[PDB]
Amino acid sequence: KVQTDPPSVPICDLYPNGVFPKGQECEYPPTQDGRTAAWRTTSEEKKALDQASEEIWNDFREAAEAHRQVRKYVMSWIKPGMTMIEICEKLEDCSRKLIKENGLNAGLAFPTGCSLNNCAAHYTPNAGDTTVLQYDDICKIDFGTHISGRIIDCAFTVTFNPKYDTLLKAVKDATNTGIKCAGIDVRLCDVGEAIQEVMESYEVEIDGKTYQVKPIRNLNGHSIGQYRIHAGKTVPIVATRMEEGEVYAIETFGSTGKGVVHDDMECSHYMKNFDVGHVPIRLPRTKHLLNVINENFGTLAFCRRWLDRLGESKYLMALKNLCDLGIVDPYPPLCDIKGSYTAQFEHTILLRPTCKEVVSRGDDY
Numbered sequence: 001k002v003q004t005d006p007p008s009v010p011i012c013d014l015y016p017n018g019v020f021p022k023g024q025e026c027e028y029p030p031t032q033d034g035r036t037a038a039w040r041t042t043s044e045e046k047k048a049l050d051q052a053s054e055e056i057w058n059d060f061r062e063a064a065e066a067h068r069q070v071r072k073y074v075m076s077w078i079k080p081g082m083t084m085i086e087i088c089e090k091l092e093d094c095s096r097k098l099i100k101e102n103g104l105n106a107g108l109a110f111p112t113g114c115s116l117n118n119c120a121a122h123y124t125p126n127a128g129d130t131t132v133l134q135y136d137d138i139c140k141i142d143f144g145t146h147i148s149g150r151i152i153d154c155a156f157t158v159t160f161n162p163k164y165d166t167l168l169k170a171v172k173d174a175t176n177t178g179i180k181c182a183g184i185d186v187r188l189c190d191v192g193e194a195i196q197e198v199m200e201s202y203e204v205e206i207d208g209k210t211y212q213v214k215p216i217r218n219l220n221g222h223s224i225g226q227y228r229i230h231a232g233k234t235v236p237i238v239a240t241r242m243e244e245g246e247v248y249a250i251e252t253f254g255s256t257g258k259g260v261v262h263d264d265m266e267c268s269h270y271m272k273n274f275d276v277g278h279v280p281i282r283l284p285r286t287k288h289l290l291n292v293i294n295e296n297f298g299t300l301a302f303c304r305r306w307l308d309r310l311g312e313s314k315y316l317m318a319l320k321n322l323c324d325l326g327i328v329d330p331y332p333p334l335c336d337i338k339g340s341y342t343a344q345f346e347h348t349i350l351l352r353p354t355c356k357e358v359v360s361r362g363d364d365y
């Protein structure tokens with residue numbers, strides 16, 4: 001079976017034997033002492049431990065192939081004049097088809113981020129949002145796919161005006177640096193220090209103003225767990241080591257602003273607190289909403305548009321109740337100062353026993 005244009009064929013139909021394309025495979029970086037970690041590639045113990053988790057890497061690979069094909073399609077049509085809603089719906093319709101959405105077993109890991117300009121992350125339009133993409137907008141497309149809760153967290157920046165080219169270059173180089181420095185037994189702060197050094201080596205000129213690119217210090221790379229976008233370990237920009245078999249989202253953000261984000265605009269993104277157990281609720285609308293969340297999302301993130309498409313209405317008070325009880329956490333848009341520009345690149349990497357796999361790498365980024 002061959003993929004259509006626009007893509008509509010599920011990835012699992014393109015690979016019937018259930019064996020999906022590998023991402024970029026990298027030898028681990030050498031230690032401080034200069035001795036290589038190349039021994040991992042040829043170790044019989046490492047090869048066996050790697051093959052024991054083959055089904056897991058395979059689920060990430062299926063989700064990464066859906067991500068590559070969705071984003072290549074997005075790049076062919078994303079244009080100024082389109083509303084943010086139109087962009088998110090057209091992207092998500094394709095994502096659901098390629099991932100072969102099946103309740104909590106395959107689907108969308110989190111809402112389509114399409115944060116603009118000074119806003120770096122966690123903006124997706126809510127119903128009635130009339131925002132239109134502009135020629136001068138710097139748009140961060142951040143979307144997620146999953147197979148059995150094996151999440152692909154992967155993002156890029158969309159622009160139409162060449163004035164942002166050097167800012168995009170700086171961030172892409174910083175993300176790629178973070179990915180290269182990542183490895184088993186590597187200290188998380190060393191990855192962060194490598195990212196910062198590369199990011200700040202760039203100076204950019206935008207509309208007659210110059211800036212030294214700043215990494216956003218409170219938007220960090222993180223570990224990923226099953227059905228858990230952020231598994232608790234962070235790659236800090238400003239003791240903890242990466243371990244064998246861990247999975248990371250290596251993401252970096254460059255800014256012309258303060259290099260710090262704050263909560264701004266209305267909230268669209270929400271997610272159940274992973275650690276909260278069963279909570280009995282009698283309030284009817286609140287109980288119904290939590291059941292809708294448990295059935296459709298579990299511990300994966302969602303947005304208000306995703307409740308609307310399920311035929312839910314008059315749920316805002318119910319959603320506020322779940323947030324106030326600590327069952328659900330709101331994730332509002334995170335923005336730098338007015339007039340600033342932010343850019344992002346992100347990949348998911350597998351710290352396999354034998355090698356480091358940039359599972360979401362494409363020919364694009």
Ligand SMILES: CC(C)Oc1cc(N2CCNCC2)ccc1-c1c(C(N)=O)[nH]c2cc(F)c(F)cc12
Nearest residue numbers: 110111153219222229230249269270271301302331
């Ligand atoms: C605010 C921050 C940028 O992102 C997070 C912080 C957390 N927390 C850390 C501290 N401990 C509590 C959880 C968890 C999850 C995220 C998060 C990420 C991510 N980091 O890539 N992507 C998402 C998408 C969503 F739709 C969502 F709803 C949440 C996220």
Ligand SMILES: [Mn+2]
Nearest residue numbers: 142153154155
């Ligand atoms: Mn992301």
Ligand SMILES: [Mn+2]
Nearest residue numbers: 153249251346
């Ligand atoms: Mn992330």
